[PDB]
């Protein structure tokens, strides 16, 4: 990433590579600098650890910019979809349920993987059954949209599911 | 007098409505809006859909009962 350009080259003899890939051989530092000045480009230190240090004639700022661009673009096509979590309930009912389902559908369409969780309270005798059932129902509703990933799982006071979109 | 014809029948809790009025699918047959007892209200006893509660049902019209026993 960070290279010691122009006058940060203390090294006495440097192996100079041109603007295109033309090897200008083993050169003096001063000579290299002069050459760089002539092109109106920087003399970059791309090989500090190599014998007669591998020094490149290039526009350094531009290169840096390019690198930055590369970094940035990569982190969208690497961040590249996330986990939306819906937290249902026990005695959950009609309209609200439908709304939640709709939300889930929308998320799936978007491309975001779905944690289908339920936060619980107490009276964990009834809890596993109905909770499981609701989740299963939800999955069935979206078997035309999503693949079942993490099947019914306890997290202590929670019960979580996970869905992913069919064609990504 | 106090005319006692009250049917003391058990049932699984079905649908949690407002006011703690629980539809209870009885061991007798059809579910009705059977509400919670005063005792239960006093002692602070939460029922969830998933318990086998005793509902004290009337013979005049089997549409309303009373959840007496805790689960
Ligand atoms: N120990 C404890 N239990 C609580 C508290 N608040 C609610 N609960 C319990 O959690 C359940 C209901 O959860 P939510 O608060 O709706 C009931 O069993 C109730 O007694 C609290 O502050 N402490
Ligand atoms: O002190 C608290 C607050 C919330 N909760 C949980 O959060 C739920 C509602 O959150 P609020 O903070 O009321 C409640 O039903 C519990 O599951 C506790 O368990 N304790
Ligand atoms: O706010 C409350 C309500 C009930 N409780 C107690 O918790 C017990 C069970 O709670 P739930 O409703 O399952 C209940 O019998 C009470 O003794 C609390 O600790 N805090
Ligand atoms: Mg009587």
UniProtKB/Swiss-Prot annotation, chain A:
Keywords from the UniProt entry: Cytoplasm, Initiation factor, Protein biosynthesis
Family annotation (SUPFAM superfamilies): Translation initiation factor IF3, C-terminal domain, Translation initiation factor IF3, N-terminal domain
Localisation per UniProt entry: Cytoplasm
Alphabetical GO biological process terms: ribosome disassembly
Classification via Pfam families: IF3_C, IF3_N
GO molecular function: ribosome binding; translation initiation factor activity
Matches recorded under Gene3D superfamilies: Translation initiation factor 3 (IF-3), C-terminal domain (3.30.110.10), Translation initiation factor 3 (IF-3), N-terminal domain (3.10.20.80)
GO cellular component annotations of the record: cytosol; membrane
Domain of life: Bacteria
Principal subcellular localisation of the protein: cytoplasm
Family the UniProt entry places it in: Belongs to the IF-3 family.
NCBIfam families referenced in this protein's UniProt entry, alphabetically: infC
Function summary: IF-3 binds to the 30S ribosomal subunit and shifts the equilibrium between 70S ribosomes and their 50S and 30S subunits in favor of the free subunits, thus enhancing the availability of 30S subunits on which protein synthesis initiation begins.
Subunit structure of this chain's protein: Monomer. Binds to proteins S7, S11 and S18 of the small ribosomal subunit.
Protein name: Translation initiation factor IF-3
Recorded name of the encoding gene: infC
Curated annotation (Swiss-Prot), chain B:
UniProt superkingdom: Bacteria
Family named by the database record: Belongs to the IF-1 family.
PROSITE patterns hit by this protein: S1_IF1_TYPE
Record function comment: One of the essential components for the initiation of protein synthesis. Binds in the vicinity of the A-site. Stabilizes the binding of IF-2 and IF-3 on the 30S subunit to which N-formylmethionyl-tRNA(fMet) subsequently binds. Helps modulate mRNA selection, yielding the 30S pre-initiation complex (PIC). Upon addition of the 50S ribosomal subunit IF-1, IF-2 and IF-3 are released leaving the mature 70S translation initiation complex.
InterPro entries tied to this protein: NA-bd_OB-fold (IPR012340), RNA-binding_domain_S1_IF1 (IPR006196), TIF_IF1 (IPR004368)
Pfam families in UniProt: eIF-1a
Subcellular location as annotated: Cytoplasm
Organism: Thermus thermophilus (strain ATCC 27634 / DSM 579 / HB8)
Disulfide bonds, paired cysteine numbers: none
Gene name as annotated: infA
CDD domains: S1_IF1
Domain S1-like span(s) in chain numbering: 1-71
GO MF, one example: ribosome binding
This protein's UniProt keywords: Cytoplasm, Initiation factor, Protein biosynthesis, RNA-binding, rRNA-binding
Subunit text: Binds to the 30S ribosomal subunit, contacting protein S12 and the 16S rRNA. Component of the 30S ribosomal translation pre-initiation complex which assembles on the 30S ribosome in the order IF-2 and IF-3, IF-1 and N-formylmethionyl-tRNA(fMet); mRNA recruitment can occur at any time during PIC assembly.
Name of the molecule in the record: Translation initiation factor IF-1
GO CC term, one of those recorded: cytosol
């Amino acid at each position: 990433k960070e290279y010691l350009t122009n006058e940060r080259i203390r090294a006495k003899q440097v192996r100079v590579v041109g603007p295109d890939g033309k090897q200008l051989g083993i050169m003096d530092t001063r000579e290299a600098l002069r050459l760089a000045q002539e092109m109106d480009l920087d003399l970059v230190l791309v090989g500090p650890n190599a014998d007669p240090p591998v020094a490149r004639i290039m526009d350094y700022s531009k290169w840096r910019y390019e690198q930055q661009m590369a970094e940035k673009e990569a982190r969208k096509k690497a961040k590249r979809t996330e986990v939306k979590s819906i937290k249902f309930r026990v005695k959950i009912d009609e309209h609200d349920y439908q709304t939640k389902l709709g939300h889930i559908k929308r998320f799936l369409q978007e491309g975001h993987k779905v944690k289908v969780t339920i936060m619980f309270r107490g009276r964990e005798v009834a809890h596993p059954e109905l909770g499981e059932r609701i989740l299963n129902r939800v999955t069935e509703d979206l078997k035309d949209l999503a693949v079942v990933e993490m099947k019914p799982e306890m997290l202590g006071r929670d019960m979580n599911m996970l869905l992913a979109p069919v064609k990504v | 007098a106090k005319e006692k014809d009250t049917i003391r029948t058990e049932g699984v809790v079905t649908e949690a409505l407002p006011n703690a009025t629980f539809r209870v699918k009885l061991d007798s047959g059809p579910e009705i809006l059977a509400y919670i007892s005063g005792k239960m209200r006093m002692h602070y006893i939460r029922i969830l859909p998933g318990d086998r509660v005793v509902v004290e049902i009337t013979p005049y019209d089997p549409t309303r009962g009373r959840i007496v026993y805790r689960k």
